[PDB]
Design an enzyme around this catalytic site. Structure first.
Site, PDB file in Angstrom:
ATOM      1  N   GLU A  35       0.892  -1.149  -0.121  1.00  0.00           N
ATOM      2  CA  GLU A  35      -0.070  -0.128   0.157  1.00  0.00           C
ATOM      3  C   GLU A  35       0.866   1.254  -0.120  1.00  0.00           C
ATOM      4  OE1 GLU A  35      -3.123   0.676  -0.538  1.00  0.00           O
ATOM      5  OE2 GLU A  35      -3.980  -1.366  -0.054  1.00  0.00           O
ATOM      6  N   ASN A  46      -8.007   9.198  -5.503  1.00  0.00           N
ATOM      7  CA  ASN A  46      -8.448   8.018  -6.042  1.00  0.00           C
ATOM      8  C   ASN A  46      -9.366   8.852  -7.221  1.00  0.00           C
ATOM      9  OD1 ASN A  46      -8.878   6.943  -2.904  1.00  0.00           O
ATOM     10  ND2 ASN A  46      -7.594   6.036  -4.239  1.00  0.00           N
ATOM     11  N   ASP A  48     -12.463   8.928  -7.695  1.00  0.00           N
ATOM     12  CA  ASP A  48     -13.926   9.486  -7.025  1.00  0.00           C
ATOM     13  C   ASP A  48     -13.558  10.821  -6.119  1.00  0.00           C
ATOM     14  OD1 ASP A  48     -12.765   8.699  -4.584  1.00  0.00           O
ATOM     15  OD2 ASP A  48     -14.169   7.126  -4.204  1.00  0.00           O
ATOM     16  N   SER A  50     -11.855  10.928  -3.568  1.00  0.00           N
ATOM     17  CA  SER A  50     -11.077  10.781  -2.326  1.00  0.00           C
ATOM     18  C   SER A  50      -9.762  10.698  -2.353  1.00  0.00           C
ATOM     19  CB  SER A  50     -11.884   9.560  -1.583  1.00  0.00           C
ATOM     20  OG  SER A  50     -11.387   8.430  -2.489  1.00  0.00           O
ATOM     21  N   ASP A  52      -6.306   8.343  -0.216  1.00  0.00           N
ATOM     22  CA  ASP A  52      -5.829   7.484   0.638  1.00  0.00           C
ATOM     23  C   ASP A  52      -4.574   7.967   1.193  1.00  0.00           C
ATOM     24  OD1 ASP A  52      -7.515   5.565  -0.578  1.00  0.00           O
ATOM     25  OD2 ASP A  52      -6.097   4.613  -1.461  1.00  0.00           O
ATOM     26  N   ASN A  59      -8.937   5.627   3.319  1.00  0.00           N
ATOM     27  CA  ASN A  59      -9.549   6.385   2.453  1.00  0.00           C
ATOM     28  C   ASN A  59     -10.326   7.480   2.970  1.00  0.00           C
ATOM     29  OD1 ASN A  59     -12.356   6.576   0.481  1.00  0.00           O
ATOM     30  ND2 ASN A  59     -10.303   6.467  -0.768  1.00  0.00           N
TER      31      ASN A  59
END
Ligand SMILES: [Cl-]
Ligand code: NI
Length: 129
Positions: A35, A46, A48, A50, A52, A59
Site C-alpha cells: 500500500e 482516487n 472518485d 477521495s 488514501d 480512504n
C-alpha cells in the site's frame, strides 16, 4: 517515516495487530508494503475524488476527514493528516475498525491482489518479535 520491515512488524505487534480478527502479523506487514512501501507519509488520490492516507492507505470517503471529500463519513473520527504521523497508533486504531467492518482485509485492494493466499509469514521472518 519510512519503516524497516522488522521495525514495522514490531510496532504493529505492540499495537495489537498480530492475529487481530484472525489476521496474522505477516498479513499486516505485507499490506503495508504494497500500500505505502512502509512510508507513513504516503498519499494517493482516487478517481472518485477521495484520497488514501498513510502506511495503510486509509480512504477519506469513509474513514477520515480531509476537508475536500464531499459526503465523507469520517468513521474513525480523525483528520486524515493524523494518519501520516511517525507514530502509527491512529492508523492502527482506524485499521482495526476497518477490518471489523465485514469484508475483513479485502478492504485493502493490494492485500487481496498481492498478499492473500501467499506465504505471508515470509514478511516477518528473521525478525526479533
Ligand atoms: Cl475475515
Ligand atoms: Ni486505496
Amino acid at each position: 517515516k519510512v519503516f524497516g520491515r522488522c521495525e514495522l512488524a514490531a510496532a504493529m505487534k505492540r499495537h495489537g495487530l498480530d492475529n487481530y480478527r484472525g489476521y496474522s502479523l505477516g498479513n499486516w506487514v505485507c499490506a503495508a508494503k504494497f500500500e505505502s512501501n512502509f512510508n507513513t507519509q504516503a498519499t494517493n488520490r482516487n478517481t472518485d475524488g477521495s484520497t488514501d492516507y498513510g502506511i495503510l492507505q486509509i480512504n477519506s470517503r469513509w474513514w477520515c476527514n480531509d476537508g475536500r471529500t464531499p459526503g465523507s463519513r469520517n468513521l474513525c473520527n480523525i483528520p486524515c493528516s493524523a494518519l501520516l504521523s511517525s507514530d502509527i497508533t491512529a492508523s492502527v486504531n482506524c485499521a482495526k475498525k476497518i477490518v471489523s467492518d465485514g469484508n475483513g482485509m479485502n478492504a485493502w485492494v493490494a492485500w487481496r491482489n498481492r498478499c492473500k493466499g501467499t506465504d505471508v509469514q515470509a514478511w516477518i521472518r528473521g525478525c526479533r518479535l
